[PDB]
């Protein structure tokens, strides 16, 4: 249960920084995702819209 999922529209390069225990600018001031996080990350093209 408790299968919570997100939605963000974010800058291309910064994508990789969204992983457990990783630094940067989003990882500090815009988002934290828990350390030892076992969940799943899915991304794709939205320049088209």
């Amino acid at each position, epitope marked *: 249960t408790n299968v919570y999922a997100d939605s963000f529209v974010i800058r291309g390069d910064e994508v990789r920084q969204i992983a457990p225990g990783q630094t940067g600018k989003i990882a500090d001031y815009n988002y934290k995702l828990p350390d030892d996080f076992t969940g799943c990350v899915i991304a*794709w*093209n939205s*320049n*088209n819209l």
Partner: antibody, heavy 121, light 108 residues
């Protein structure tokens, strides 16, 4: 020395079976997913099989659905592949290949290629 | 299913000039197309992935562009290292697979 070398090339009658191998070397085997893509003589590339880096999932192309078995043994860091019910079209240069991505599931690109083994029937 | 349609059937041109091939996909693929360059007998090597991204080991004289069902590759300066055949490639959901094109030969 980041290379794959295939193994098991030979000739067999129609209806019979063959088992091939790819040896991997120069990198950590159990961290990438592996493909085999086969290049029929005089023709283009046709993907045959894949395996995830953790060996939990495989997909096979339509031409080989249910007929080949893809498997990795990390003990020797050697990939294998069994074959069943080979037919005349199966003649090819099986290039064992390595997936491009480290720990991504998308499985689109082949970054590094075995020299390719002839197999004909 | 996507069947790639390649034009012109062949190119004949002098070295040093600008060579532009076109690959018109049947239906939109977003941004997900690759180019493969195969010399006679050789092993093809990826050139472009994501349909404008210059993959590693590729001098900047190789450029490609396009999305949806328009995709074209340009070469600034042809040299005998570059005179080969070329395919346009993608991936699929229904039925999962890959469809290549027919191939496009280059001549002096």
């Amino acid at each position: 020395q980041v290379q794959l070398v295939e193994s098991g090339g030979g000739v067999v009658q129609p209806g019979r079976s063959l088992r091939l191998s790819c040896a991997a070397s120069g990198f950590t085997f159990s961290s990438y997913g592996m493909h085999w893509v086969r290049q029929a003589p005089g023709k283009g590339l046709e993907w045959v099989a894949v395996i995830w880096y953790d060996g939990t999932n495989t997909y096979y192309a339509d031409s080989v659905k249910g007929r080949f078995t893809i498997s990795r043994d990390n003990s020797k860091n050697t990939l294998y592949l069994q074959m069943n019910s080979l037919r005349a079209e199966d003649t090819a240069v099986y290039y064992c290949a390595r997936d491009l991505a480290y720990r991504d599931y998308v499985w689109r690109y082949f970054d590094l290629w075995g020299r390719g083994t002839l197999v004909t029937v | 299913e996507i069947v790639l349609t390649q034009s012109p059937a062949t190119l004949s041109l002098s070295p040093g000039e600008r060579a532009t091939l076109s690959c018109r996909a049947s239906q939109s693929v977003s941004t997900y197309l690759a180019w493969y360059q195969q010399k006679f007998g050789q092993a093809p090597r990826l050139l472009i992935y994501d349909a404008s991204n210059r993959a590693t080991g590729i001098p900047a004289r190789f450029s490609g562009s396009g999305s949806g069902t328009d995709f074209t590759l340009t070469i600034s300066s042809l040299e005998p290292e570059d005179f080969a055949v070329y395919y346009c490639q993608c991936r699929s959901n229904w039925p999962p697979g890959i469809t290549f094109g027919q191939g496009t030969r280059l001549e002096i």
